Amino acid sequence: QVQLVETGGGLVQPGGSLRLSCGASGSIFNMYAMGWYRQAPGKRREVVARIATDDSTMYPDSVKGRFTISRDNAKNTVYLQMNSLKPEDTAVYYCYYQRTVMSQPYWGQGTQVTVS
Amino acid sequence: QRVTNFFKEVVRELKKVSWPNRKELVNYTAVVLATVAFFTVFFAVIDLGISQLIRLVF
């Protein structure tokens, strides 16, 4: 119901940084979860970052420390600031939201972050 | 050649088993397919119902 325009996918040299911006449409953002996952080829998407409604952020230990998240309500942007890039971080990227704990998580379109 | 004697004994044993006849075989398959089809539809309908009630209450 809320579309996601996820911009910021650019070719960065491996060992750099990047910023991804998930622009949403509807502005309530008392949402149960927001976040980002990859789903590269070589599938089974890894949930890269995830914000609770209490801003209690989680990451896997694959990208722990190197990736930061940000969410500013009433200005519909969710930011994933990627630091210390790598050739295995080369993947397409998808922002996601989830309204409540019983909702279904509704995805976005692809954002190819190619790190070479 | 003991194993061919044993398999002749297995085939001889299978003729003393009281297999179900065709009438009760058809009645049993009717009961099984009716139970599986009814519970498939029953569980699909109550999954749809619980899903709509969950969408209402959150």
Added chain:
Amino acid sequence: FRTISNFMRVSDIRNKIIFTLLMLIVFRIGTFIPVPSVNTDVLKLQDQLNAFGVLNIFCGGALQNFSIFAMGVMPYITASIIVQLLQMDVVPKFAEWSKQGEMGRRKLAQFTRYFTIVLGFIQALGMSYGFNNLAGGMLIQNPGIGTYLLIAVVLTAGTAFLMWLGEQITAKGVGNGISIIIFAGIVSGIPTILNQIYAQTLNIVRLLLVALAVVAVIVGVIYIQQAFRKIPIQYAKRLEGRNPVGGHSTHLPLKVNPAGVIPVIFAVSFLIAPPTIASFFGTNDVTLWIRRTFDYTHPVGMTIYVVLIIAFTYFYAFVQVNPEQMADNLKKQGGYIPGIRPGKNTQEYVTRILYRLTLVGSLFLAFIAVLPVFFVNFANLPPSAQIGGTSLLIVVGVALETMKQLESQLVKRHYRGFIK
């Protein structure tokens, strides 16, 4: 059909049918309820297909579920099979408890319930930790040991609630309790599998061939499951005068598959134990070889799987039937097979019967267990299906046994009389 209208005309049968359906609605309602700190969006993002709900995922080609009923009654199943294996000359206290009667049986049932709670706790800990590793550490928020023990005690509470629900639906409901709950788990998984097969789609006639093969295998399962070898038994402790009929004679029926489905429990434990112990050692050459040959969707692993199903069917048929205990019980109560001396000779008579019947039942069980691999490979089905495994045997058995229980309740009303 007429008989399902005859059931709803009797008030007691209709009462317990409706109570059973209400308990199954309760089970499904609870299967929609999430666990405390399990962060359901990464769970629903983990699957390889699109299931229905948020707690249902399609992981490993199986419809997995992470509600408060995530274990189901599986700890009760494994606790009962462990306690039954412990009764047979391993723990002596259990042996004499079984030898006592209907009150030592209550001691064994009490031990099985406490062991169920213990095994449910251990399985909930392993399950929550393994699912959190599957999600990448993202599944459990606050991954401290207090949260793991909260999750483990609420999954064990869910499984103990399912066992109470089974006690209810066998006391005031249609049939056996735990068997109805297991049947409900399988056939509640059916509609989302049909939705995946629809969302995939020569193909219409391919699925028609698949449905006709499924009805053919259901007929074969009913054929093997309802077949008894009836050994005649003669009792020599009543006069049996005045033209004995011979129609309702006493006999001892052995099933063709006396083991059931339990040989597949032992065979898949033997097939999953080398990959877990190799997964603790990290990736190597021999770890990848152990992972490659113990995977039963490829012919070396399928051969090991079939061989272990046949061997454990022979073992568990002789555990379940136990021809020596049968020969001693027949000698003690005074019966005998006509022609055979009631001591050791009846033991080896029914041992030979059991060898031949167990060959046929073990081949049937192995074929039924490796059928879904062939349907997935040679019907281009999604790997989500598992179409015709041992869940087919469980579904057929519970359906037929509940039908027989209902007809037995029905015939107490039809005592005619010669006057009428």
Added chain:
Amino acid sequence: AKKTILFLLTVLTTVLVSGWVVLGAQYEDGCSGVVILKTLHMFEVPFLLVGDSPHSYHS
């Protein structure tokens, strides 16, 4: 030696109750060949093991 094989099968059945810990450790295709889910949904409760003088008033 039936006690040894029965105890070996008891430890394999609790391998099935505890073997859920190996889900993402060495595959890294997370559930693409793990058989635990199938085992969890494939089984039923085992069936329970099986194991004076009357008088009469003459008329």
Added chain:
Amino acid sequence: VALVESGGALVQPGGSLRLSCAASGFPVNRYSMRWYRQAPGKEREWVAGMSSAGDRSSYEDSVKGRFTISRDDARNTVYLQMNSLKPEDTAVYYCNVNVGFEYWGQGTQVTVS
């Protein structure tokens, strides 16, 4: 099968009275029925009777030329006659048939006095 006789009365020695025997449980079309008599004190002797319906009928020589056993299948019964009877033939008369077993009637008392 249960032969019941009736038609027995006190008949003077110049009157003739028919004696009926109703058969119940078998056709008279295919069974030879016989009429016996026994006086009080006498042993039970054979008086009259015909078999295989209507082409032949025999009597005893104390009633020969006098008695006639007849029957009717639509009524399914047999009839005697007490024509020209003398006080010598006071008896209880019996209807006898043989279908499998031998069935006797209850006996009709006629005394000619």
Added chain:
Amino acid sequence: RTLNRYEKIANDIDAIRGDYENLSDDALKHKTIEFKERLEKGATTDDLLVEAFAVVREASRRVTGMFPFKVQLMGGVALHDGNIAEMKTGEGKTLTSTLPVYLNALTGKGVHVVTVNEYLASRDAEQMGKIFEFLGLTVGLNLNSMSKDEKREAYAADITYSTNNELGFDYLRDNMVLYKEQMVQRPLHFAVIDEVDSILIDEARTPLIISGQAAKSTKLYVQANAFVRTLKAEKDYTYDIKTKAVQLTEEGMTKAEKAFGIDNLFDVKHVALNHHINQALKAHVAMQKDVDYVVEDGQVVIVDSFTGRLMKGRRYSEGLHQAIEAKEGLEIQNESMTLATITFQNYFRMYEKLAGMTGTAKTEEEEFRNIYNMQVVTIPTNRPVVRDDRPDLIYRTMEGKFKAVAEDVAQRYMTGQPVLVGTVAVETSELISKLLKNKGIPHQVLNAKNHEREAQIIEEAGQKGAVTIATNMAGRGTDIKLGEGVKELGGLAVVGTERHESRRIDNQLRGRSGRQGDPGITQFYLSMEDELMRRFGAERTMAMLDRFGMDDSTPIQSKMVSRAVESSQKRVEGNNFDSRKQLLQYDDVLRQQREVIYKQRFEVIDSENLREIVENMIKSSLERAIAAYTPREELPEEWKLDGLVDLINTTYLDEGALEKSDIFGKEPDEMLELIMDRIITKYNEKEEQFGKEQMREFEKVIVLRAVDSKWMDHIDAMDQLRQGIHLRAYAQTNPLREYQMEGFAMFEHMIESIEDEVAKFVMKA
């Protein structure tokens, strides 16, 4: 809580017995007439309860001298409610029976007061019948020895005292009569069961069975007895002491096949020889003479396991009685054949109202709730139990225990205190009597064999210096009264000598000592080779009886043997629990069948026209005969209809009345209607010629003979099915459901045979 209700009603009765006291007789006998007309106008028994109970209190004080205590009124209200009044042993339960028995006999439908044996029935009948005949009712006493006319006079009275066996057998024989006016019992209205736990819990493990004699065989009994008498107790048979099962060994089977010239004893042509060898083994090994039976006047008489007295008419089933008579060298009698069967659960659950009182109900309370829907109510005592229940003295051997028992009896005889020694069997009672004969102690013995002097022995058993050795006969309801000075010696020491099969039974023996606030000692002397310990003791504790030493002058002062004694008794109680549960559900199957058959046989008996019943039987037999040919599958003329014509002419329509042309190409219902109206006009001619009431007598004899013969065969076939049904549990089915389904199929085939026989015998006669 109901006990405060019982206390409130008892205080109500106390106030108005203040009112009822100064009334003459003929003014207190008039209260029965007054209550009868008030009960016919509009009142219920529950509204009359306090005035009727106060009238019985005053009448009892006028007749017997006893004026019932308020706990007796509480027990009487608990009996009127249909509950179980658990008053202690000695408390006065006979007067508390007379309160609701009078209240519930005013409606005129009859009250049965059931007791355990005939001594107690005759005793209670005499005393409480003096009370009831003061009040104006009529008390019959139904005994085993009465004729049918005396039994009919006993049941026609207002209150009938009997034992449970005679009530069960009278019910079973009332459903075997030919005329309605041969039935002795009235409709079953109210049963007050004295000693409920004996009758409804202990003795309900057994069914009542009426048999009738079949043909006699004798040669195989003497042959098998002459074989078994040479058989070497350990090589050729095993006697299992736990369940008293005697089986041949393979050496014994080889010797059996050599002695009889056969080649295989376990063929199907030698099942009679195998049955005779097994019953001669059980008669020799498992049935000891003065324990299980007696030999009286050249006959084997069974000593009852519960009551401990001789069952004179009763015989062992399945050829065991004939094997015992061949063993003893007596005349072997005919075989038998089960005519009727009922259990005590299914008998007493027919009774429209059921009460009971006992001393020992509380441990069986849930059983009384599950089966009979009766609630055990515990009543206070009004005087505390001053009886001294000492713990058991466990010994190593039986000779040491019996030496101790004789020494105890000797040193209580020297003071003058009366002793009652309580055994179980007749032979241990004679053993301990000869143990006191030398030592010179004058005693009385109350065995099954000494039953004639019983009412005399009990009147002397509580005097000064009175030793009484008594079996199970004494320890259930016997009221021993104490003589002069005996209450100062602490009268009636009960010396038990074995644990019984429950705590209730040995609590009843202790209750022989107690007796309403009087002093008394109850010591049990057990042993470690007692039959309870040898049969049901666990094999762990049965190893260290060498560890305790071999002296036997002092008891084993351990606490592991006491746990073993208690656990063995709990093992017997659990075995009896499960055995009576099994007998309950399988006779629930036969209970449904028997209730259908007995109700329809009775309405065959009191039906003054049987034309409709017999015609429906002929029509049902004819519909099945039509549908036996003429099946639904092969419709066009593959129907073999000349075979059906031959069947109709051999079964219904006198040999010529049907040809193929009458039923050619017809629908099954129109050929049914054609044959049926031919049958109706043949029936009308039969009813015309045969007579009108004579025809009813004829077909009543036909119908009752068919019902009786097929029902006896069905009882036999149902017994055989119940033999094999646990073997059906080997195929992972529930065997009770298999019993119910095969019993339904067997019953319906039996009723089809009844209809076929009645149709053939009516139409072809």
Added chain:
Amino acid sequence: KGEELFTGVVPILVELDGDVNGHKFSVSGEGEGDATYGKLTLKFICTTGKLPVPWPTLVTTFVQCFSRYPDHMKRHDFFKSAMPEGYVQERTISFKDDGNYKTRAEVKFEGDTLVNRIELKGIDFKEDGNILGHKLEYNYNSHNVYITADKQKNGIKANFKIRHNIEDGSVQLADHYQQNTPIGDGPVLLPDNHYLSTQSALSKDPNEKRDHMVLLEFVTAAGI
């Protein structure tokens, strides 16, 4: 005891040879006898050809020990005293209006089985009567055999009359005088007058080819 030993079912061999008017006959047969119910189920086969005298004139010649006794007449039997030792019976059978049978039979337990060895000689016959004219209906009636004892011969003399349904509608009253002799000489039992109330049934087998007589028969006694 003796036949109280044979309460179970007994094999019955019957062998008969005989001559009437120089004309030969030979009939055999086999069946079963029962005493506690007291019946005879016998399949008899004419193994020579055709019957000179018909089967109803044969049936009283065709084994009187298979009676049914109630409890009181157990003392009053002769036919359980000469058995298993053996039995001999001869009869003078007078046909009224025709000649005479002298029948000559020994009825004994040969080995186990009850063999009735009969030689029948029928003299004083004219062929143009009813019996050699085969005027008999295929039936046999119900009767009462009167039994008394003699002590000069210490055996049993039996008197009875029998009634054959003639196909013309008449009856042949024929009287049997029967002499009954032991073979062994053990405990003889000579009771008073009593009577065997007997009834019979003659029928055939639809799946049998030759001229054969099937006999089913009930015996009871009464009087004492």
